[PDB]
């Protein structure tokens, strides 16, 4: 182990990008009504985390316990 951190309808939007060993996470929230489709609109995202972990990230898997959409920058 190298890095550890513990801290203490809806539409949740996240942006993940990796550069220079830093993982940047951006988060925004918007209230909507329909689940099936992405609604059209404008919404801005504020910074949350800049994690200093220097690995190549080439794949990811979502962890589940009702839809999610993925686009590429």
């Amino acid at each position: 182990c190298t890095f550890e951190y513990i801290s203490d309808k809806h539409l949740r939007e996240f942006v993940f990008k990796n550069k220079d060993g830093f993982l940047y996470v951006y988060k925004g929230y918007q209230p909507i009504d329909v689940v099936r489709d992405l609604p059209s609109g404008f919404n801005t995202l504020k910074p949350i985390f800049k994690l200093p972990l220097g690995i190549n990230i080439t794949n990811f898997r979502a962890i589940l316990t009702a839809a999610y959409f993925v686009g590429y920058l």
Partner: protein, 113 residues
């Protein structure tokens, strides 16, 4: 530089190295492609205790995108308003007058441009 530790071209910081031959390992020589800057990977060749070993510490500075935390001994003074003064705010130096402002800052911002 290519397979073990790559420094970015836009580096802002310092490099410190010294000699410990009195105190007295593995490195990587085969890999598929060069490393991106500030990346690690855990084809390994061992050193022989070709010249005396050296210890290296590299300091990288994060330039005030967050509230300031690490800086040296200087004594804070009372602020003087509506008067032409030299000012030093968190290492940001200027000459001007300072007034109360109606602008509103979101918490991640520290200065306006």
């Amino acid at each position: 530089a290519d397979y073990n530790y790559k420094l970015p071209d836009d580096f802002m910081g310092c490099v410190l190295a010294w000699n410990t031959r009195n105190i007295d390992y593995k490195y990587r020589y085969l890999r598929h492609g060069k490393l991106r800057p500030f990346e690690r990977d855990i084809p390994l060749n061992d050193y022989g205790f070709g010249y005396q070993p050296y210890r290296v510490v590299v300091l990288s500075f994060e330039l005030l995108n967050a509230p300031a935390t690490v800086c040296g001994p200087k004594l804070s003074t009372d602020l003087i308003k509506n008067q032409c003064v030299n000012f030093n705010f968190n290492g940001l130096t200027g000459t001007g007058v300072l007034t109360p402002s109606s602008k509103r800052f979101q918490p991640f911002q520290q200065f306006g441009r």
